Amino acid sequence: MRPLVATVDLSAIRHNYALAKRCAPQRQAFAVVKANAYGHGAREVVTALHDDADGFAVACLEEAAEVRALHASARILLLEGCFEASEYALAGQLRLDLVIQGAEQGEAFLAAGLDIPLNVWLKLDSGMHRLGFDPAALRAWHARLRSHPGVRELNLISHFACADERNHPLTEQQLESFLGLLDLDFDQRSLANSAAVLTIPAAHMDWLRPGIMLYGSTPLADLSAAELGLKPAMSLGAQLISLREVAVGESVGYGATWIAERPARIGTVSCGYADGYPRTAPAGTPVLVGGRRAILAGRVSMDMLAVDLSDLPEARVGDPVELWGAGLSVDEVARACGTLGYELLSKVTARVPRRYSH
């Protein structure tokens, strides 16, 4: 088989979830498992956290349906709520926690006429300015929904825009904006993402919403996952499929963007952008070969990648290549590529086989 495997350490995820829990020991935490549990496998992640998780949060009904099929009783939150009229009936049947974040969505809920009472989370836009109500509108919808027969729990949710930064003004502003609604009778309040879980105890409220940290990728711009005690879940391992000698002045890969200055050893790796790796990953991007540090040379192809092995003379065809995992953080690779671990993990494509360990 093509030597490229994503290994998922499930005990790391449980460890990381327990760690998030320890940040607010008397409180509750959603396991955010949207986008196929951030590329790790929603079915397997929900199974590993079946008893551990206070609840689950997802991006859509398709994902919610998948979680419910696996956990018959657990709390499942639709982070974006329902997208259309026909979803409400199914949401009722699967006993989902709903989000109302706009007027259209709120009017759709009212028009649905569901018999079964559900928990409804009203979304405050506290500065992100994408989804959510402004305070006046949320107050209006709190009034219309508090004593509604189909509402079991009326709750409050909002999201930080810059919680990853150690001291961005908007963070404190959002927190104070969230507290501007302390007067309204809410059954639950939720504010904290991974970054907030770890660094803003005042925002913990009732339900934490850790996503990225569960997978051993840092939510913070200034602290690494290793510094935070998070264990990496995904190991994307490949192999050296080719070794070449490249003479001075000769180029490597598309566009002839990499030119040898000295007699060079160039290794080809069984990983490309069709696997999820960034196409535009620059020269100098780290990679591990036989557990040793090396760097990218030349453009990343659809199915192949190239590395400079001029300083690794013992490296041979067949040697294991770690793109990211326990030895090289997905965050380090991501940053060198001008992006975040979020993206690298999310986009590991279907063609990449998944293994699961403990």
Place this chain on the structure above:
Amino acid sequence: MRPLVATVDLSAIRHNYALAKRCAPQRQAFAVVKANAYGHGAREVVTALHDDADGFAVACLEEAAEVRALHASARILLLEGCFEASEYALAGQLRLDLVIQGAEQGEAFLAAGLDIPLNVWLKLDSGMHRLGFDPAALRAWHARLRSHPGVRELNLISHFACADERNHPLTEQQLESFLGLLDLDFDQRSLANSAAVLTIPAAHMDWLRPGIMLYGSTPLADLSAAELGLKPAMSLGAQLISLREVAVGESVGYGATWIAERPARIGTVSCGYADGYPRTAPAGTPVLVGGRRAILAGRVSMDMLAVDLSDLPEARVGDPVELWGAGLSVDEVARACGTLGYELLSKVTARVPRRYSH
């Protein structure tokens, strides 16, 4: 359901394939369908090109097995050959065309001792400098393999590094390298990718290898798919799921990257980087709202994207959003994102449903 669908026009692929064949009508053409037919769905693309295609080219044995399952007799080329010794027996069962690029791989084929002779394509490294033999080694391997009992067809293959550019020096070097071997007895010669199929008739040889052009994305740096008469295969459509008023000095999305300079109208779209969209898509990346041109505002998140709707007063929640397709070229969007159509197309993730048009 979540309002995000990748609509694939299969008859556009048939059209683009016939256009590739018309570049060299007396010659044959491989339909390059690797990486799930560049995200378009290998099963459906191969079915559409079941009789049209002279043969198929893929990146690995797994992909080849899928193709053989659908077409019992078609020529299937493994572009990178077999990755390990144990693959050869299966490659033999599936009656695949093999590639030999390196000494290790060549030795593995020799050692395999297969039951049936197979077509063998020897790969010349003509300047790409990742895969393939130097001219001397290829001549040596030709001498070994020309009357070897396990070889049915002995062929020559190489691949351009800069055929996307108008007249790059390396393109001539690569062509001269290839031609310098044509004193040797070869059954088939293959050199031309999409770029070369359209612009380098001297590279046409016996078998063309069009990939990207099949899907209506330009392979060339300075001509567009429309100018080349290529019909776009994939249409990625979403919807406005939210619409907001944003005051001057207020920010949008993570990191507060986008700050409103006039009273702004801002819409949220049901597409994000976990769907395959580039996370780092900058401000000014084009989008269509109700068929009308508009630009991105704020960081792309995992499941959501934001657009500036200030100059489209009639835009409403529920309106269709074209991320790319027949209205807006995947090539234009990719150029704005500092990458190519290849990446955007082939990274559309499993959770984006594919619909096929008729």
